[PDB]
Amino acid sequence: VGLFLPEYNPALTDYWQTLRLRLFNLRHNLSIDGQPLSLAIYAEPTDPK
Amino acid sequence: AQTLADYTAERLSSVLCNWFLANIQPEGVSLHSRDDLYSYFLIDNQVSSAIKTTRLAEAIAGIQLYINRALNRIEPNARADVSTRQFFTDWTVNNRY
Amino acid sequence: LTLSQSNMDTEISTLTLSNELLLEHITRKTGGDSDALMESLSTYRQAID
Amino acid sequence: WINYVYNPAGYIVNGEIAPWIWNCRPLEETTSWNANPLDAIDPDAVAQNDPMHYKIATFMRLLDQLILRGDMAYRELTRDALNEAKMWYVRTLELLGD
């Protein structure tokens, strides 16, 4: 056998990828574009010597 | 202290999910992944600690998930007669608060 | 479940509810206490985590 | 409108769940009504030769609608909207499989 093999459907893989990305964004408290929705902190340095 | 508590909660959740998946099996349900636990117990154990909710809201979400799974014949042995009530017939309008 | 105002209004983390449910199930299975469960988990080897 | 062709929850006939899966009879029985589909470049002709591709097309349309609903719910940023979007995404994922 030296023939070629069948290929998956790209559209379904696209659906799976989109679902995975959306679920990951939802579970980690991020917007639909990946922008974080929580403010960070600065941890100001405590003076010089 | 709050950040440490969140980290501890996440680690404990992962450890407990792994232990339950490894040691305990229910009577007639086979589950092999964390998503299976999510679908079985109707509560998401993979969420980050940042998100917040109320008990009634999570109960509503769990029951809605259970109804959606049962209606679409994903979970076997669903009662056919019960699934034809007036409430489920209009599920296109009762699935959201 | 009790349909009280406090249950309706009080904020809480989903991870807390999931952990409490899983802990209840595990303690019911092993018949021990939460502290005993943690001490046992300190030496458990038959898992990946 | 799409429930007249496919509905995962089944169809209520005379007050009971109907035994068939697809409401469109030719799709259910897979009746072919085209014998020369490769005479010209025409995806519709190929689908007519084997109506299974019509099944897959309808399924893909349903998934598209579900994902669009989820995105619309997500774009509101309200907690209830986030829960609704999560429900739509979970439903689509369960329909698709692994």
Give the DSSP letter string of C2-34: ---HHHHH--EEHHHHHHHHHHHHHHHHH---H
Q: How far is C43 from chain B (nearest CA, A)?
A: 13
D46 min Cα distance to partner chain B (Å): 30
Nearest by Cα to B16 from C31, C27, A26 = C27
Q: What are φ and ψ of residue A35, in 5° steps?
A: -70, 130
Alpha carbon of D14 to those of B44, B82, D6, D7, D25: distances in Å? 39, 15, 18, 17, 18
- CA distances (Å), B2 to each of A28, A35, B7, B8, in order? 17, 23, 9, 10
Q: Is B3 on the interface with A (CB under 8 A)?
A: no
SS3 A30: strand
Distance between CA atoms of A28 and D67, rounded to whole angstroms? Answer: 19
- Start-end of H helices in chain D: 25-29, 43-49, 52-74, 79-96
What are the φ and ψ backbone dihedral angles of D70, each rounded to 5 degrees?
-60, -45
CA distance D38 to chain A (A): 20
Distance, CA of A45 to CA of C24 (rounded, Å) = 44
Chain B CB within 8 Å of residue C26 CB = yes
Residue D27, class by beta-carbon neighbours within 10 Å (0-12 exposed, 13-18 middle, 19+ buried)? middle
Rounded-to-integer distance, Cα B73 and Cα B83, Å:
11
The C-alpha of B24 sits at a distance from chain D's nearest C-alpha, in angstroms, of 24
Contacts of B52 (CB under 8 A, 6+ apart): C11, C12, C13, C14
Residues of chain A in contact with residue B50, where contact means CB-CB under 8 angstroms, are: 28-29, 38
Q: What is A5-27 written as a DSSP string?
A: -----HHHHHHHHHHHHHHHHHH
DSSP E strands, B1-97:
52-53
Give yes or no for D39 touching B (CB within 8 A): no
Q: CA A47 → CA A40, A44, B96, distances in Å?
A: 21, 9, 54
Shortest CA distance to D48 belongs to which of D60, D29, D30, D64?
D30
- Residues D50, D64: Cα–Cα separation, whole Å: 23
Residue B47, judged by CB atoms within 10 A of its CB (0-12, 13-18, 19+), counts as buried
Round to whole Å and give the CA distance between B28 and B55: 28
Check CB contact under 8 Å for B65 and D9: no
Closest to D1 in 3D by CA, of D51, D82, D61 = D61
For residues D38 and D49, give the distance between their C-alpha atoms in angstroms, rounded to a whole number. 10
What is d(CA D57, CA D60) in angstroms, rounded to the nearest whole number?
Answer: 5
For chain B positions 30-49, those within 8 Å of chain C (CB to CB) are 41, 43-45, 47-49
Look at residue D90 and give its three-state secondary structure: helix
Which residues in chain C are closer than 8 Å to B55, comparing Cβ atoms? 1, 7-8, 10, 12, 17
Closest residue in chain A to residue B45, using alpha carbons only: A27
Q: Which residues pair with A30 in a beta bridge?
A: A36
Please give the structure tokens belonging to residue B85.
């009530």
Phi and psi, residue D29, nearest 5°:
-90, -5
